[PDB]
Design a binder for this molecule. Structure first.
Ligand SMILES: [Mg+2]
Ligand SMILES: [Mn+2]
Lengths: 15, 474
C-alpha cells in the first residue's frame, strides 16, 4: 500500500 | 506543489497535541494493525529518529510545468467537462447571500458552528461564533470588513496547518505519515461558498456517473444506483493516486478555474479569483511559515468537489493524450476526490496512461497492489470505492456497501472518551452489510456493556432506505 490508507474517511458527514 | 521558501519569522502556531482517541474493549480482542496518528514528533511509536515535520511536508515534490500544447489540450478537456457539467446542472450559479452561506440551501449543508477559525483569529484566541452569528445568518465586525477586501480583490491570507487526529495503519503510523488539514480563515470559507455555493449544492443533488461525482451521495442507498451502472461495462478500473492534493500543478489548477467557473456559466467574476488564491498558499506550522506554489490545501471549502472536477478532467486529458478521437461518452467514471471508478466497453490500457498522468505530476497505480499492473476485465465486485466494496445482497438482490472486517475492527478499537455508545450506533449502520455473523463478531466484546442494535432492526431499516417499495413489497 502506498499513501492510500484503508481506514480514514467516508464522505464528509451526513447529508 | 513547490515549496519556494522556508522561513521561521515571529509567532508559533501551536499544533502539537495528544490524541483523544482511547482504546476500547474491542482493541484487546481484535488487536488491529491500526493506531492513532502521531501528533507529536517525540512519539515513542515513531520509527528510528524520523522527524515528523520532515515527512509531513515531503509530499511537495515540486510543481510540474506543462507545455503550451499540454495546456491547450487540458483546456479543451476542461471546457468539454465543464460543458457537460453545466449542461446538466444549469447556469443558476449566482452568488449566495451572506445568510445562505451560513445556513446552507437545499443540498449544501450549514457552515460548522464552532470549528477552527483559521488565521489571524487563532493568533487572537477567539471562536467561529465570536466572529459570525451562526444562529442569525450574518457576521461580525472584521468579517463583514474581510468580505469587502475579498470583494475588491485586495484580500490576502495564510493557511493554518492542523494535525489530523485519526486511526491509521500502523505502518503509516510508525513512518509518521500523519495526514494534515489546512484550515483556512473562516471568511475565506464563507466567501468561497458565496461564489460557488449553489454550484456545490447542485453538484451534491445531481451526484452520479453522469457528472462523474459521488460527492453528496448516500452510500447506503446510492450503491444500488452506482452498482447497476458500472455492471453494464466490459472493463472496470480501480485507480489510485499518490498525494492527489499536493500534486495538482499550477497550470492545471488555474486552467480548470478559468474554464469551469466562467462568468458565461452564471458565476460572479470573483468565483475564478477566490479559487485562484488556493494555488499559491502560505502555511503556518508552529514557528515555520512556508509558501507553497501548486497543489491544493487539504481542508478548504469544496475541496472534495474541486478534486473531483480535476480527477474528471485528468482521465479525459490522459486518454486524449494517448488515444485518437476520445470523447466523454467513450468511458464513464465516478469520483470522490481521489477515489475513482472508471469503466469502458473499450479495452483501455491504463499501464500506458502512467506518463500522461505524470505530465500533470500525478502518479497512477492500481489500488489492487498485486504486481502493480493495470490489468483488464475487472468487474464492479472487484473495486474499492469510498472504502466500500460493491456486493450483491443475497436477501433482497440489491447492492450493499461492505467494508473489510479489518477496517471495521479498526474503527471500533479506538474511540474518543465517552462517545463509545453513539459511535457503536453509527458504526453499526456501516457494519450491517458484512452479514449477520460478522456483525455479531464485530460487536461481541461490547455485549452487556453497551446497547447494540439488533442485526434485524438495521437490516429492515436499510431495505426501506434503498427502495421505499422494497420493504413494502416483501
Ligand atoms: Mg491529505
Ligand atoms: Mn487517501
Amino acid at each position: 500500500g502506498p499513501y492510500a490508507g484503508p481506514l480514514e474517511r467516508q464522505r464528509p458527514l451526513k447529508v | 506543489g513547490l515549496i519556494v521558501d522556508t522561513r521561521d519569522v515571529e509567532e508559533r502556531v501551536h499544533v502539537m497535541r495528544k490524541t483523544k482517541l482511547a482504546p476500547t474493549v474491542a482493541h484487546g480482542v481484535f488487536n488491529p494493525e491500526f493506531g492513532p496518528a502521531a501528533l507529536s514528533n517525540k512519539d515513542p511509536r515513531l520509527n528510528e529518529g524520523v522527524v515528523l515535520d520532515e515527512v509531513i511536508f515531503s509530499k511537495h515534490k515540486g510543481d510540474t510545468k506543462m507545455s503550451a500544447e499540454d495546456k491547450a489540450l487540458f483546456r479543451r478537456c476542461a471546457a468539454d467537462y465543464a460543458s457537460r457539467l453545466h449542461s446538466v446542472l444549469g447556469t443558476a450559479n449566482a452568488p449566495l447571500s451572506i445568510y445562505e452561506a451560513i445556513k446552507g440551501v437545499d443540498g449544501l449543508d450549514a457552515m460548522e458552528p464552532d470549528t477552527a477559525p483559521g488565521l489571524p483569529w487563532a493568533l487572537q484566541g477567539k471562536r467561529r461564533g465570536a466572529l459570525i452569528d451562526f444562529e442569525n445568518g450574518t457576521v461580525g465586525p472584521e468579517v463583514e470588513a474581510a468580505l469587502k477586501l475579498m470583494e475588491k480583490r485586495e484580500y490576502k491570507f495564510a493557511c493554518q496547518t492542523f494535525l489530523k487526529d485519526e486511526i491509521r495503519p500502523m505502518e503509516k503510523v510508525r513512518a509518521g505519515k500523519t495526514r494534515i488539514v489546512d484550515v483556512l480563515p473562516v471568511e475565506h470559507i464563507l466567501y468561497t461558498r458565496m461564489m460557488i455555493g449553489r454550484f456545490c449544492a447542485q453538484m451534491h443533488s445531481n451526484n452520479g456517473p453522469q457528472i462523474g461525482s459521488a460527492v453528496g451521495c448516500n452510500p447506503d442507498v446510492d450503491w444500488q444506483r452506482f452498482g447497476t451502472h458500472f455492471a453494464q461495462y466490459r472493463n472496470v478500473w480501480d485507480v489510485d493516486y499518490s498525494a492527489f492534493d499536493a500534486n495538482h500543478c499550477s497550470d492545471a489548477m488555474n486552467i480548470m478555474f478559468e474554464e469551469v467557473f466562467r462568468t458565461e456559466f452564471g458565476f460572479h467574476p470573483n468565483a475564478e479569483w477566490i479559487l485562484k488564491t488556493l494555488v499559491n498558499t502560505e502555511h503556518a506550522y508552529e514557528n515555520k511559515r512556508i509558501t507553497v506554489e501548486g497543489g491544493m490545501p487539504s481542508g478548504c471549502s469544496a475541496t472534495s468537489i474541486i478534486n473531483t472536477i480535476l480527477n474528471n478532467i485528468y482521465v479525459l486529458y490522459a486518454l486524449r493524450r494517448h488515444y485518437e478521437g476520445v470523447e466523454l461518452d467513450t468511458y464513464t467514471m465516478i469520483s470522490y476526490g481521489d477515489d475513482i471508478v472508471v469503466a469502458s466497453d473499450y479495452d483501455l490500457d491504463f499501464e500506458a496512461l502512467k506518463p500522461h498522468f505524470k505530465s500533470l505530476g500525478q502518479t497512477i497505480t492500481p489500488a489492487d497492489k498485486s504486481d502493480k499492473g493495470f490489468v483488464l476485465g475487472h468487474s464492479i465486485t472487484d473495486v474499492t470505492f469510498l472504502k466500500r466494496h460493491f456486493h450483491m445482497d443475497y436477501g433482497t438482490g440489491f447492492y450493499k456497501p461492505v467494508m473489510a472486517s479489518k477496517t471495521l475492527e479498526a474503527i471500533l478499537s479506538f474511540a474518543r472518551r465517552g462517545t463509545i455508545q453513539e459511535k457503536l450506533i453509527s458504526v453499526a449502520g456501516l457494519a450491517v452489510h458484512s452479514g449477520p455473523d460478522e456483525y455479531r463478531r464485530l460487536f461481541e466484546p461490547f455485549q452487556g456493556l453497551f446497547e447494540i442494535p439488533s442485526y434485524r432492526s438495521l437490516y429492515l431499516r436499510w431495505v426501506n432506505a434503498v427502495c421505499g417499495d422494497a420493504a413494502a413489497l416483501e
